[PDB]
Enzyme design. Sequence first.
Site, PDB file in Angstrom:
ATOM      1  N   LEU A  31       0.835  -1.191   0.000  1.00  0.00           N
ATOM      2  CA  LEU A  31       0.000   0.000   0.000  1.00  0.00           C
ATOM      3  C   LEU A  31       0.872   1.244   0.000  1.00  0.00           C
ATOM      4  O   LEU A  31       0.449   2.304  -0.453  1.00  0.00           O
ATOM      5  CB  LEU A  31      -0.947  -0.003   1.197  1.00  0.00           C
ATOM      6  CG  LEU A  31      -2.046  -1.054   1.057  1.00  0.00           C
ATOM      7  CD1 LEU A  31      -2.897  -1.141   2.303  1.00  0.00           C
ATOM      8  CD2 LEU A  31      -2.902  -0.725  -0.160  1.00  0.00           C
ATOM      9  N   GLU A  35       6.756   5.873   7.959  1.00  0.00           N
ATOM     10  CA  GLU A  35       7.874   6.509   8.653  1.00  0.00           C
ATOM     11  C   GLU A  35       9.003   5.530   8.986  1.00  0.00           C
ATOM     12  O   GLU A  35      10.166   5.921   9.073  1.00  0.00           O
ATOM     13  CB  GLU A  35       7.374   7.218   9.923  1.00  0.00           C
ATOM     14  CG  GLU A  35       8.374   8.192  10.569  1.00  0.00           C
ATOM     15  CD  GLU A  35       9.357   7.516  11.526  1.00  0.00           C
ATOM     16  OE1 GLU A  35       8.963   6.543  12.207  1.00  0.00           O
ATOM     17  OE2 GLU A  35      10.526   7.960  11.594  1.00  0.00           O
ATOM     18  N   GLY A  37       8.575   1.789   8.013  1.00  0.00           N
ATOM     19  CA  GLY A  37       8.444   0.550   7.267  1.00  0.00           C
ATOM     20  C   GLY A  37       7.481   0.622   6.103  1.00  0.00           C
ATOM     21  O   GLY A  37       7.162   1.700   5.602  1.00  0.00           O
ATOM     22  N   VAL A  39       3.705  -0.761   4.283  1.00  0.00           N
ATOM     23  CA  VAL A  39       2.366  -1.211   4.620  1.00  0.00           C
ATOM     24  C   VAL A  39       1.814  -2.001   3.453  1.00  0.00           C
ATOM     25  O   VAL A  39       1.833  -1.526   2.316  1.00  0.00           O
ATOM     26  CB  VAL A  39       1.425  -0.036   4.910  1.00  0.00           C
ATOM     27  CG1 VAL A  39       0.046  -0.558   5.308  1.00  0.00           C
ATOM     28  CG2 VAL A  39       2.007   0.854   6.003  1.00  0.00           C
ATOM     29  N   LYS A  59       1.711  -3.715   8.858  1.00  0.00           N
ATOM     30  CA  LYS A  59       2.926  -2.907   8.897  1.00  0.00           C
ATOM     31  C   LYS A  59       4.128  -3.782   9.214  1.00  0.00           C
ATOM     32  O   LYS A  59       4.087  -4.610  10.123  1.00  0.00           O
ATOM     33  CB  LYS A  59       2.795  -1.785   9.919  1.00  0.00           C
ATOM     34  CG  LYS A  59       1.813  -0.706   9.509  1.00  0.00           C
ATOM     35  CD  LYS A  59       2.129   0.583  10.233  1.00  0.00           C
ATOM     36  CE  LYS A  59       1.182   1.696   9.856  1.00  0.00           C
ATOM     37  NZ  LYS A  59       1.650   2.984  10.435  1.00  0.00           N
ATOM     38  N   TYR A 107      -7.957  -1.868   8.232  1.00  0.00           N
ATOM     39  CA  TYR A 107      -7.791  -1.429   6.849  1.00  0.00           C
ATOM     40  C   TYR A 107      -8.696  -0.238   6.536  1.00  0.00           C
ATOM     41  O   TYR A 107      -9.916  -0.318   6.680  1.00  0.00           O
ATOM     42  CB  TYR A 107      -8.104  -2.578   5.885  1.00  0.00           C
ATOM     43  CG  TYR A 107      -8.131  -2.177   4.422  1.00  0.00           C
ATOM     44  CD1 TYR A 107      -6.964  -1.815   3.753  1.00  0.00           C
ATOM     45  CD2 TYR A 107      -9.320  -2.176   3.706  1.00  0.00           C
ATOM     46  CE1 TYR A 107      -6.990  -1.450   2.413  1.00  0.00           C
ATOM     47  CE2 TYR A 107      -9.356  -1.818   2.373  1.00  0.00           C
ATOM     48  CZ  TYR A 107      -8.187  -1.454   1.732  1.00  0.00           C
ATOM     49  OH  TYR A 107      -8.230  -1.098   0.401  1.00  0.00           O
ATOM     50  N   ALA A 108      -8.095   0.868   6.118  1.00  0.00           N
ATOM     51  CA  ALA A 108      -8.866   2.038   5.711  1.00  0.00           C
ATOM     52  C   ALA A 108      -9.025   2.048   4.194  1.00  0.00           C
ATOM     53  O   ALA A 108      -8.043   2.182   3.456  1.00  0.00           O
ATOM     54  CB  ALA A 108      -8.197   3.313   6.198  1.00  0.00           C
ATOM     55  N   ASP A 156       3.484  13.625  14.728  1.00  0.00           N
ATOM     56  CA  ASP A 156       3.611  13.509  13.275  1.00  0.00           C
ATOM     57  C   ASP A 156       2.245  13.656  12.594  1.00  0.00           C
ATOM     58  O   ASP A 156       1.943  12.972  11.616  1.00  0.00           O
ATOM     59  CB  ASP A 156       4.284  12.174  12.908  1.00  0.00           C
ATOM     60  CG  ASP A 156       4.830  12.154  11.485  1.00  0.00           C
ATOM     61  OD1 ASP A 156       4.827  13.216  10.824  1.00  0.00           O
ATOM     62  OD2 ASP A 156       5.256  11.068  11.027  1.00  0.00           O
ATOM     63  N   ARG A 160      -0.992  13.042   5.327  1.00  0.00           N
ATOM     64  CA  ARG A 160      -0.431  11.760   4.891  1.00  0.00           C
ATOM     65  C   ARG A 160      -0.614  10.689   5.959  1.00  0.00           C
ATOM     66  O   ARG A 160      -0.591   9.489   5.673  1.00  0.00           O
ATOM     67  CB  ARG A 160       1.063  11.894   4.562  1.00  0.00           C
ATOM     68  CG  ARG A 160       1.978  12.106   5.782  1.00  0.00           C
ATOM     69  CD  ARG A 160       3.464  11.900   5.443  1.00  0.00           C
ATOM     70  NE  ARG A 160       4.356  12.393   6.499  1.00  0.00           N
ATOM     71  CZ  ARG A 160       4.947  11.631   7.418  1.00  0.00           C
ATOM     72  NH1 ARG A 160       4.766  10.315   7.425  1.00  0.00           N
ATOM     73  NH2 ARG A 160       5.733  12.186   8.333  1.00  0.00           N
ATOM     74  N   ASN A 161      -0.785  11.135   7.200  1.00  0.00           N
ATOM     75  CA  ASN A 161      -0.863  10.243   8.357  1.00  0.00           C
ATOM     76  C   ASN A 161      -2.268  10.088   8.929  1.00  0.00           C
ATOM     77  O   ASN A 161      -2.463   9.481   9.984  1.00  0.00           O
ATOM     78  CB  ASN A 161       0.112  10.718   9.440  1.00  0.00           C
ATOM     79  CG  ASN A 161       1.560  10.490   9.043  1.00  0.00           C
ATOM     80  OD1 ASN A 161       1.859   9.557   8.292  1.00  0.00           O
ATOM     81  ND2 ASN A 161       2.462  11.336   9.533  1.00  0.00           N
ATOM     82  N   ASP A 174      -0.196   6.109  12.148  1.00  0.00           N
ATOM     83  CA  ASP A 174       1.258   6.313  12.224  1.00  0.00           C
ATOM     84  C   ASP A 174       1.731   6.777  13.601  1.00  0.00           C
ATOM     85  O   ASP A 174       2.066   7.947  13.809  1.00  0.00           O
ATOM     86  CB  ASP A 174       1.731   7.281  11.129  1.00  0.00           C
ATOM     87  CG  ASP A 174       1.418   6.773   9.726  1.00  0.00           C
ATOM     88  OD1 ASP A 174       0.256   6.910   9.287  1.00  0.00           O
ATOM     89  OD2 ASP A 174       2.330   6.232   9.063  1.00  0.00           O
TER      90      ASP A 174
HETATM   91  N1  LIG Z   1      -4.408   0.889   7.936  1.00  0.00           N
HETATM   92  C1  LIG Z   1      -4.199   1.255   6.646  1.00  0.00           C
HETATM   93  N2  LIG Z   1      -5.101   0.973   5.681  1.00  0.00           N
HETATM   94  C2  LIG Z   1      -4.907   1.334   4.397  1.00  0.00           C
HETATM   95  N3  LIG Z   1      -3.817   1.987   3.964  1.00  0.00           N
HETATM   96  C3  LIG Z   1      -2.834   2.332   4.832  1.00  0.00           C
HETATM   97  C4  LIG Z   1      -2.969   1.978   6.252  1.00  0.00           C
HETATM   98  N4  LIG Z   1      -1.859   2.431   6.881  1.00  0.00           N
HETATM   99  C5  LIG Z   1      -1.079   3.027   5.943  1.00  0.00           C
HETATM  100  N5  LIG Z   1      -1.663   2.960   4.726  1.00  0.00           N
HETATM  101  C6  LIG Z   1      -1.108   3.502   3.486  1.00  0.00           C
HETATM  102  O1  LIG Z   1       0.230   3.067   3.378  1.00  0.00           O
HETATM  103  C7  LIG Z   1       1.029   4.104   2.746  1.00  0.00           C
HETATM  104  C8  LIG Z   1       2.214   4.428   3.630  1.00  0.00           C
HETATM  105  O2  LIG Z   1       1.814   4.855   4.927  1.00  0.00           O
HETATM  106  C9  LIG Z   1       0.077   5.268   2.461  1.00  0.00           C
HETATM  107  O3  LIG Z   1      -0.434   5.152   1.132  1.00  0.00           O
HETATM  108  C10 LIG Z   1      -1.058   5.026   3.446  1.00  0.00           C
HETATM  109  O4  LIG Z   1      -2.294   5.573   3.047  1.00  0.00           O
END
Ligand SMILES: Nc1ncnc2c1ncn2[C@@H]1O[C@H](CO)[C@@H](O)[C@H]1O
Lengths: 295, 295
Positions: A31, A35, A37, A39, A59, A107-108, A156, A160-161, A174
């Site tokens: 994905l 910061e 690692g 995802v 992560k 998962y978002a 942070d 983006r976070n 994050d």
């Molecule tokens: N829990 C999550 N669900 C979906 N995407 C994520 C999640 N955590 C981080 N990301 C995505 O991973 C990438 C690095 O943080 C970004 O595109 C961010 O949107």
Amino acid sequence: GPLSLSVDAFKILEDPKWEFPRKNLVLGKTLGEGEFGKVVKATAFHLKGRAGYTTVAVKMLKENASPSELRDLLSEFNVLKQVNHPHVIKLYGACSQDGPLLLIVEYAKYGSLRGFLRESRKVDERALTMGDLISFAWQISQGMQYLAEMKLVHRDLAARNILVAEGRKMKISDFGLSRDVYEEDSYVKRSQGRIPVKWTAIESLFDHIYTTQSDVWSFGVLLWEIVTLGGNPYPGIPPERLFNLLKTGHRMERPDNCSEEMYRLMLQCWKQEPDKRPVFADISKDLEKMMVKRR
Amino acid sequence: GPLSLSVDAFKILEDPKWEFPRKNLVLGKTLGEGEFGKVVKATAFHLKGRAGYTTVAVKMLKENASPSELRDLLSEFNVLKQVNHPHVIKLYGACSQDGPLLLIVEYAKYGSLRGFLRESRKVDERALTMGDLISFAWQISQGMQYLAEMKLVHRDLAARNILVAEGRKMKISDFGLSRDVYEEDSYVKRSQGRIPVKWTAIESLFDHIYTTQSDVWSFGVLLWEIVTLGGNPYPGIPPERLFNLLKTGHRMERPDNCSEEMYRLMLQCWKQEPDKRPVFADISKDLEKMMVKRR
Ligand SMILES: Nc1ncnc2c1ncn2[C@@H]1O[C@H](CO)[C@@H](O)[C@H]1O
Ligand SMILES: Nc1ncnc2c1ncn2[C@@H]1O[C@H](CO)[C@@H](O)[C@H]1O
């Protein structure tokens, strides 16, 4: 040293309430990289009482991870297991044995708020109203109020976070750099911070002091990001110029499509004196009032 | 704080001997991203007495740079202006005003040693002999001997951080994490290091002590990278397992296409006791002897 102690101790409490069998986890596409690692999208079988497969995000450490990155991953794990709020990303578990350390989180669906905003437009295919933007800011302020009451500084905060989940729900995410602040109401770091310059409060930049009030500063920059639909802060200005720029009292100007009240709120978040900035409870009330007013 | 002091002071000595007019520099494609920023290919007009355009590489801060990254960039600049050796990458100048901070360095035609090795094979299109590999290792050991005599510890020695210039000349690069060691023969860092775990000496990992002897450990891993034509160290092993693995005396096994003497040298570089590891002068003599022997 401190990390070897954490790692050994970590591999000592295989806490059944967080430990998840690696064989029940299937990893998918990357994905992105955060910061500390990377995802990846994933699915987990029989996760936390849930029958069948559940889509999750995982992560993990990047290739050639450093001790700092490993520490950050463990830090985020430590924080996430203490927090629970509708606007903070949810931890589901971890895989800590028979393979690389993995955190399994909620998962978002729409990914980062920054990407979400950039794909949109104001009413670029998704139509967002100012009302939607205020709503997003408010949900985040609510989450931050919760974290602040928990005596945690995020450090942070940025578009983006923040993640956007089903129903366009904001999820603060994050937590690798987040710190416990209970004893002293501040976190002080001797060495240089790893948070981007343009989101960092003036006293954090110069004096390495982080508080909830420094998170409030970051929220102001986040606010600017939301209003500009994912613009880049201090555009065209090198990060190293921010030292002089901030200390001589300069701030970002009022962006387009931004009311006087909204800009006032940003400016208040960027007051030089941390005590003059509003608290998150104040911020939420300000946004609520803007919401009801334009109706 | 310390960084604001460095930045202000930096923008105080616009040293004409390093300052280069931004208008005489033209930036091109991104070559990649290093420890603190990005590297782009570029050309510089009338650079350091050279008539016409000179092809160069330029190091700059990435988007959303942090104070740590800005510090690292300034650190590399500070070091590079003190060093000069045929196997250390050459600094040509910097742009510090009227725009983002830029370092202008020698362009290495073949890029990183890691990429160079991976594109090759042993005699995958470029044919390398064991003699070539020994030669590469030797040039690097020579450069390190120079840096060690200069009382500098590199800290981030790895194939990704060696460059291959015209004529297949090795250039040690990436000096962002390098430290002056003159007073105490060690550099000690309180916080977690930002060097990849798998290249870091055991005492550096556990005790945060960095010396020339810890650079020697890294050279051993680099040696392994060279012999395996750019293999990944401790393959299949999570970085967090290295704490226990190293302290229980485990090391990487002898790889394929590697003589007994070469492996012995690697093992010596990875002795637990830093004083039992060879110095770079010893390493160079060992490699020289291997060279002449197979002839
Ligand atoms: N829990 C999550 N669900 C979906 N995407 C994520 C999640 N955590 C981080 N990301 C995505 O991973 C990438 C690095 O943080 C970004 O595109 C961010 O949107
Ligand atoms: N001086 C240089 N010349 C050519 N390529 C470089 C130089 N410095 C770094 N790089 C490349 O930039 C990327 C990130 O360090 C890598 O691909 C590396 O090889």
